[PDB]
Symmetry: C6
Subunit: 63 residues, 6 copies
């Protein structure tokens, strides 16, 4: 009653692998290249987003 829980997780890790799966992460990052430039332009965003963050900002482990 121990190595039968975490072990299951281990199986998932094998599935992800680094071959085909590795390619997917790299490819996605490259594609957003063009996406990145339009995204950059945007005014009126000084603290408006931060207020939402304020809820997040205190944080609490023992939530």
């Amino acid at each position: 009653g121990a190595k039968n829980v975490i072990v299951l997780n281990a199986a998932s890790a094998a599935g992800n692998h680094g071959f085909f799966w590795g390619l997917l992460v790299v490819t996605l990052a490259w594609h957003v290249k063009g996406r990145l430039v339009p995204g950059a332009t945007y005014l009126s965003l000084g603290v408006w987003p931060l207020l939402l963050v304020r809820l997040l900002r205190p944080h609490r482990a023992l939530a």
Copy 2:
């Protein structure tokens, strides 16, 4: 040390805690309804898929 580490993970959980976040799961589930029926159509792919599955089927865990 042993602590602080796991504690940090808990903080992430706090971030998740947000009624808005909960709402997102429901919307995705409802939308897929329509997606599901077209998917069922068994066009040209009776056994072709399964060969790929064989690689997946062992589900190694040694990694």
Copy 3:
């Protein structure tokens, strides 16, 4: 080796700690707003979905 593992996970948690990351999750939830209403209207999949769920319903950590 012992702490040179869980500690590594903790480092990932620090990475999450970013206002930008927090903003993305909240934003995604809001977007599905419009998506949610069409999903509601369908009227179908009465008993057809549940049968599949039956396999899923017992669930088990053994796997």
Copy 4:
């Protein structure tokens, strides 16, 4: 296989750490900016949606 299962998880964390991969997360968060304003429109969403949320509301960590 004591220190082997947890170790595997650590390896996954290494995979996440990257240059190109990091850029994608930041870009996506700011970009959704535009998506957020349309989302705000509360067209017939006063409280009706919440009833569905009630199912989600108990949560129950017992699972």
Copy 5:
């Protein structure tokens, strides 16, 4: 708090488990069926992108 940190994670897991949520996973998989066939057809990228992937292939865990 020993049994409070990990416990928080468990709560998240319970939330993931459900009826509507289960449906989402199956539908997404079925839908990509048709998506998969066009993907297969792609000229070039047979033996050239892999070299970049090679850097990823050794992988590590000493992150």
Copy 6:
């Protein structure tokens, strides 16, 4: 108790165990092939990304 929290996670892993799920990961990887080449051709920044990563670069798992 001790063997209960982690046990819940194991249950999630069982859910993944599904050939259909396996199909989705491979499909996504194949599709991005085409996405990868357009990404390669864009603009010449060179300094725009590194500045962002630089903030990330010191790292502080002591979050």
